[model samples]
Target: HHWGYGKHNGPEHWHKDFPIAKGERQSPVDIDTHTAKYDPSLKPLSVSYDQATSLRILNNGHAFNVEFDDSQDKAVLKGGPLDGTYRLIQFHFHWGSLDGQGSEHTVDKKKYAAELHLVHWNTKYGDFGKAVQQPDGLAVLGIFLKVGSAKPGLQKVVDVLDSIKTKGKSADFTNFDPRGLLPESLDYWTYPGSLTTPPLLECVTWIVLKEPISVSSEQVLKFRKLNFNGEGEPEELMVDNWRPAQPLKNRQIKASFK
Candidate 1:
């Protein structure tokens, strides 16, 4: 019923249903540090996440999303290109069939094993659904995942994947701080871009972390075990869910650190 990341229905065909797919500010652009401009004025990001606010994890057919309680101001992101506080709504990922090329964004045209997206909506906007229609309404923190040693913070997340293996499945997931999953260095690259998903709205201000977190090969393989089809439908491996990088066009990437 909706668009998917298959040979026939994936990102290549997204333009047919969502014209904005070809928009000027499309996301997941290749980040080339050689050309990025260092701006000393860019403020450091202030992330405050309350582990108690984590709600549940769900297999959204497209990707596995860990939802958070955004009704309160407990878990929020501020500073660094953000005009005001931004509520942490949910977080999800994009991966591939193999470890060599799965990440949505690349640095110097080199891909990683996966990519994590921490979705947030501006407090100035009433809600996430409404905010998607306005420019500067959403802020997404992207962290790259490379194959290596196991990450304790991420292992807590991977532990629950078994329960939500099938599409539309979900389970209680709480008391987890999303900040623990981020890289030590908060330095990042920023630009105006759209959602990597369908109905790809150009309302997001992308803040991709310069550092990548480590994940074991086993952990990376677990993500591929997820099925794209619901229980009743034939099983389709939920791999290669990432959209290809879009052109940088006339846009410039701002770096918070030199």
Candidate 2:
């Protein structure tokens, strides 16, 4: 689901694998920071971070994705922006070659250099695995990270990059958490869209966060340093893996603010 950075890994290659990969509802690419919100209704409602959920890390080395078990379903958001009981299923990220730029979202047509996607599944869909197959069963949150002053919480993930260094390889990461990575604000833009990848299923309730998270230059590169080929012996590092922007369908994106 994440392409690090390599000729074989860039957006073009991803589209190749997922021929139907293009969609207007895809994130990061569609983020227009300068787009003047004319409609008062199009503003962020609220953003809430659920502290009760646990961030679980797996060893699938090609990419890093956090898995949220059943306990995570109990995370009751407080004063949250949206009114929904979606559970955190997993969160993953996508980046470019450098720390300064590689994300798909363009603020004023300017790519932030990197993007993070925290995917959730609506409890209305029975369970997590079953929800993935349903069109309206997923909610993916998008956040952009650019070159900044200080990045504090990112190392919690980068520190473990070395643990799963190869393709088809993974390990159980413990103690490490992802709560601090969230921004203080939860203002967001909402829209009805489809998956960013193939199958292009159009049943997603997207929430793109208004604020960004900061990560040190080193931490970003550490993620880039993750080897798609895996660890030991002939070790290989990922180069350029990202998907290009998709086309916007007939949907008009809406924003929700406080």
Candidate 3:
């Protein structure tokens, strides 16, 4: 699917093809800290990457994905509103071109330059596709990307962007554990939501961290250099792929911190 964003070119029109685009429990909600209730029973989330094998990194037209082998729980997420362990499937990014906001989830009307989605599927479902259709089958870790100091963790991903500058381009990426991408704090906000991109399945348990990680403006620019179209197709920068924040509806956002 050629889904995209900004200029109202992508998911802005997805409702025509994907009816669930306007369905209940949508993702990328504008987080209003004032409205979020501090949950006492919310345990601290845990992450482990004992078997770090980053199989591939690719320009998927919509965004860049750093994929992993999830046949077994080499890397996994647990606790913080999750019923059981969730396997690390892949991690991707949504970013602005240069002079605009690109974060899918905004904080109290404040926008970040970019956002990172660490996708995980619940182990009980037995399959990624099967897990995605269940209410509690996915638990995504959302982290805001602010423009500041250069992030060494992100540099590894950025270093390979030029090789995969065109859509459908990819390269072997190995031995890189994603744990380096996290911020100092594990504090977060939890809610039920959907995949921000197309096939907007509403099955994600969003765990948006309170602290953001920093990346330089130059590094952010590296992403803007990527082509949303494949080689030979007239291409444009794959920017603004973020879905605007959806309505909260009857959903409640709980904070893991006071």
Please identify model 1 stretches exceeding 4 Å from their true place.
none
The candidate with the higher TM-score, 1 or 3, is 1
Q: What C-alpha lDDT do the candidate models reach, one value each?
A: 0.92, 0.61, 0.89
Report how far residue 126 has shifted in candidate 3, in Å. 0.8
Off by over 4 Å in 2: 1-19, 22-28, 33-56, 59-62, 76-83, 198-200, 231-236
How well does candidate 3 match the true structure in TM-score terms? 0.97
- TM for every model, in the order presented, reads 0.98, 0.79, 0.97
Query: How many clashing residue pairs, candidate 2?
Result: 32
Total clashing pairs for each candidate:
0, 32, 0
lDDT tens readout by residue for model 1, 99-196:
99999999999999999999999988778998999889999999999999998888888889989988889999989888779899999999999999
Compare the candidates by TM-score and give the number of the best one.
1
Candidate 3 CA-lDDT value: 0.89
Top-down lDDT ranking:
1, 3, 2
lDDT at 93, model 3? 89
User: What RMSD does each model have against the real structure?
Assistant: 1.0, 3.7, 1.3
Shift of residue 128 alpha carbon in model 1, Å? 0.6
Cα error of candidate 3 at position 243, Å: 0.6
Model 3 poorest ten-residue lDDT run: 1-10
Which has the better lDDT: candidate 1, or candidate 3? 1
